[PDB]
Amino acid sequence: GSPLPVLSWANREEVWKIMLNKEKTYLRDQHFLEQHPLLQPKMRAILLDWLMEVCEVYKLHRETFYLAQDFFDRYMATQENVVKTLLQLIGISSLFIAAKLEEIYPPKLHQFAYVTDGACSGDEILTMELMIMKALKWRLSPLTIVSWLNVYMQVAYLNQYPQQIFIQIAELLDLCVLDVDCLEFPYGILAASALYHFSSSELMQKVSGYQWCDIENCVKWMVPFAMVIRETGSSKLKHFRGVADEDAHNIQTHRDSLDLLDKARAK
Amino acid sequence: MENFQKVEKIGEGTYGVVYKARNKLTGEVVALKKIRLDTETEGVPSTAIREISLLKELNHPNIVKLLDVIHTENKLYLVFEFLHQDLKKFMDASALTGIPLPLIKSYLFQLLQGLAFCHSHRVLHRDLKPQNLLINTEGAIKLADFGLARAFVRTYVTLWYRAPEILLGCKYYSTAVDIWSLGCIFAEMVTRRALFPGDSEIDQLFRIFRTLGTPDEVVWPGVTSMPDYKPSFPKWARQDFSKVVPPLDEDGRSLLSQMLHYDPNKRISAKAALAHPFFQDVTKPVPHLRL
Ligand SMILES: CCn1cnc2c(Nc3cc(S(C)(=O)=O)nn3C)nc(N3CC(F)(F)C[C@H]3C(C)(C)O)nc21
């Protein structure tokens, strides 16, 4: 289907097809770590969690974090035999490219080197950024997991949107992204299934166009993650110093999500 | 980069240096955009990362093709399809005789098709102006310089082609900013001079008000609430479009006034403009499936 309304600026059939085609051409592999035998999935989760932490410290957008996450996973699928000592460099360089692209006044190169405590220099980040961009074939315009949540919220509050509900769903998506198994599902299905866990099947079909059958396997995979978030209660909307109050929902936040990931991975 | 021979330097600006070049083997003529990296503390410029990534995904006959991206120690070359001239040079060259109306119609039609493609990908060009419109000897015109191009965006184009909502402090950009620039360019092609040649933001706004009239809540609801709106703005009557654009027919004046509408929400879209009776001759009827 297609959940877009009649658009003035363009034909909704074309706008929606291009978006579906973007998800077609941008590929993700839930088994990319098999190409790196010295690496285990808990390393990816710890690295992505760390990037989320540095994102909040610099008031970086959630799109900036998801651009870095996508660049990391996609770049790692073009590589082989990577050691865990190189993972911090690949991660902070993915974040550097993303901040340059998404932020208006991104943090400076020395600030990206700083958060690594000397394990990464500015020169290394500049060498690595060119390696990542060239290996990704300059394909740096993905539709992130969080951009789909944004699309769904825009459609829901048309038929601007509320900040509190957005951050609760985003908080569930942040927990899921730490598990490489999430990469089995298209980004639009992960966001549709996170939205379902906070509403209904009727609402997700209305804002995403997906049918229940489409998101069902993803919903049953997300069930432990969603339950761990429900047990503890959802987070409250934070205020960010020097950030407009109509944009606070779009700022990346951090939580003790690694223990929540262990509870969801057990069941 | 060893397989390229620089023929001539076409320009230098914030984009870097653009050259005309030849593939020593192939024999093809390309446009090269050179970007210095050794002089960049923040690495590959954000504006170059965005342009490259965007053009890899924006393939259209009226958008300059990015053929390749070569990294050569402290340099980054972007190999583009070559075009012989920019619209400003062409317009100045044709200023005494005038650009023939059929060519103005053709260039506008192609511009709107390129713009409609960009907008269907949710991309705002943000910097539409004559020196960014590249023409060739085979009758084509293509959108160039996607450095300021943002996918929808908040407000932070050279004055003459800037939409009134931008000058009046609107917080968010829309697709209607590109339409405004095309209307200015369309009128410039017709009148052989800039429609609104201001020398400051206030001068630009007053020049727009002298031709279209000072806007009110009736023509543009929200205008008086806007950040840079002043109640002291002189009251100007909207000039008759038969004087603003004399060589234009009834269908031309209709399209131009729809592209220059004050209200961003009512300004004609690129797709809707392509279906205007001004291009009845250029456009072909397509059957609609209701379903
Ligand atoms: C890179 C894409 N591309 C392909 N063909 C051209 C091209 N062709 C051109 C313009 C004229 S002029 C000035 O004398 O009208 N001569 N030639 C041969 N000019 C440009 N320009 C003109 C510029 F000054 F160098 C800036 C650059 C721009 C940023 C707008 O893309 N870019 C081209």
For ligand 1, the distance from its centroid to the CA atom of residue B104, given in whole angstroms, is: 20
Alpha-carbon A150 to chain mean position? 12
Q: Is B83 in the pocket of ligand 1 (CB under 6 A)?
A: yes
CA A157 to each of CA A163, A164, A168, B170: distance values in angstroms, whole numbers, following the listed order: 12, 14, 16, 22
Q: How was this structure determined?
A: X-ray
Shared fold status for A27-135 and A145-266: yes
- C-alpha A59/C-alpha B153 separation (Å) is 18
For chain A, the residues before each gap (C–N > 2.5 Å) are 159
User: Which of B33, B57, B60 is the best substitution to test chain A (most A C-beta atoms within 10 A)?
Assistant: B57
Segment (H or E) for B257: helix B250-259
Helix axes A87-102, A62-76, angle to 10 degrees: 130
Are B63 and B117 in contact by the 8 Å Cβ rule? The answer is: yes
Q: Supply angle C-alpha B254, B260, B266, rounded to 5.
A: 90
Q: At what angle do helices A257-266 and A163-177 cross, to 10 degrees?
A: 60
Distance (Å, whole) CA A238 – CA A243? 11
B177 Cβ neighbours under 8 A, 6+ residues apart: B124, B126, B157, B162, B163, B165, B166, B264
Cβ-contact B198, B159 below 8 angstroms: yes
Classified by CATH at the fold level, domain A27-135 comes out as Cyclin A; domain 1 (1.10.472)
Question: CATH topology for B1-84?
Answer: Phosphorylase Kinase; domain 1 (3.30.200)
Please give the distance, rounded to the nearest whole angstrom, from the Cα atom of residue B135 to the centre of ligand 1. Answer: 9
B133 bridge partner residues: B143
- Contact between B66 and B17 under an 8 Å Cβ cutoff? The reply is no
Instruction: Determine contact, residues B6/B18, Cβ cutoff 8 Å.
Output: no
Torsion of CA A202, A205, A208, A211, to 10 degrees: 150
Distance between CA B83 and CA B10 in Å, rounded? 11
CB of B64 within 6 A of ligand 1: the answer is yes
| Phi, psi at B220, each rounded to 5° | -140, 90
Pick from B64, B107, B106, B69: which is nearest to B88 by CA? B107
Q: What are phi and psi of A144, to 5 degrees?
A: -65, 170
What letter represents residue B233's amino acid?
A: F
* Angle formed by the axes of helices A163-177 and A187-196, nearest 10°: 120
Q: Which residues of B touch A134 (CB under 8 A)?
A: 71
User: What is the DSSP code string of B181-227?
Assistant: HHHHHHHHHHHSS-S---SSHHHHHHHHHHHH----TTTSTTTTTST
Q: For B197, what's the count of Cα atoms within 13 Å in the CB-facing half-sphere?
A: 6
* Known catalytic membership, residue B127: yes
| Cβ atoms A142, A26 nearer than 8 A | yes
Q: Tell me the residue length of chain B.
A: 291
CATH homologous superfamily for the domain A145-266 = Cyclin-like (1.10.472.10)
Cβ A10–B120 below 8 Å, yes or no?
yes
CA A114 to the chain's CA centroid: 23
Interchain contact B54–A (C-beta under 8 A): yes
Distance from CA of A14 to the nearest CA of B (A): 6
> How many whole angstroms separate alpha carbon A196 and alpha carbon A214?
12
Evaluate whether A168 touches A235 at the Cβ level (below 8 Å): yes
Name, in order, each residue with C-beta under 8 angstroms of B142's C-beta and a sequence gap of 6 or more: B61, B62, B63, B64, B83, B110, B114, B133, B134, B135, B136
**From the CA of B236, how many Å to the nearest CA of chain A?**
30
Tokens of A244: 């407009």
CATH class of residue range B85-289: mainly alpha
Are A76 and A36 in contact, with CB atoms under 8 Å apart?
A: yes
**Cβ atoms of B197 and B208 closer than 8 Å:** no
Q: Whose CA is nearest to atom 7 of ligand 1?
A: B83
B81 marked as binding residue:
yes
Return the DSSP state at A234. Answer: P
Could you tell me which residues come within 8 angstroms of residue A253 by beta carbon, excluding any fewer than 6 positions away?
A52, A56, A167, A171, A174, A235, A238
CA distance A248 to A238: 7
Of the residues B22, B35, B134, which should be mutated to test ligand 1's pocket, given the most ligand atoms within 8 Å of the CB? B134
CA distance B62 to A12: 21
Checking B164-169 for CB contacts under 8 A at 24+ apart, the result is B164/B205, B164/B208, B164/B215, B164/B262, B165/B226, B165/B264, B167/B201, B167/B204, B167/B205, B167/B208, B167/B228, B168/B205, B168/B223, B168/B226, B168/B227, B168/B228, B168/B229, B169/B226, B169/B227, B169/B228, B169/B229
Domain ranges in chain B are 1-84, 85-289
Q: Where are the domains of chain A?
A: 27-135, 145-266
DSSP-assigned letter for residue A210: -
